[PDB]
Amino acid sequence: IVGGQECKDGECPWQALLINEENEGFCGGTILSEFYILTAAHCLYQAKRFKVRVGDRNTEQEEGGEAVHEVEVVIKHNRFTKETYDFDIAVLRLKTPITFRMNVAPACLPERDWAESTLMTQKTGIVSGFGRTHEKGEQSTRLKMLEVPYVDRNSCKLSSSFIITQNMFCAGYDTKQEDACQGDSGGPHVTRFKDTYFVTGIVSWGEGCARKGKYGIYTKVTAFLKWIDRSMK
């Protein structure tokens, strides 16, 4: 996360972190239930083996509330491809269930029609993660969040040097130096409605981070709500 703020205690409890063979975080996820994590399909190609940590806010400090869970099943969208970055979505089933507690709680899945008419039409959404603090920078040891404006699709297409499919949406700022970045990939974009947070996106890709004339690109979760339900059985 470039700009934004450190996420306050208890305010980003659906954040998950995928942890690789160097023991380092390399992507985020979103807690959907005791057994299921939402992430980006492209994150699966960045580590051969990984686990999921929840309830962490500071990767250099053992708070006592953190837990690491092994992955039992990976459910990658069958239409994802690295050539298009389309369908950039996967669900993980964990070997052992999460115990919800301080800093560990699931985000809501919204009903599709209402999400389109009511969530996607909000001024802003919230993205979070432990990713880099500027484009060429290092990852944050502390969990950050950022309010990012929704950006209209026509503007999104014009700004992009790559094809924006209907399974993608832009959020963020034209020139203001605030954005997600590498390391946040796979993590939550949620939209607030009357003090309840609903999953609306997955951090997917960008041409750099916080570049002028470029936006953050997110997996459009509305397009995959039935797919997530089926993946979660």
Added chain:
Amino acid sequence: KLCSLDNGDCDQFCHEEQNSVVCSCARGYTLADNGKACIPTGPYPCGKQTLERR
């Protein structure tokens, strides 16, 4: 009522069904008797920040 005005007074999901507004809630919540509010059924319902230490 219309869902386009104050979300049909619904806490969460609103739909206009048989030409009439019906509210509903995510899993982990039960729709209240007043047919508008969403009541958590557990201490960690989806989409709530964990602000009260238990």
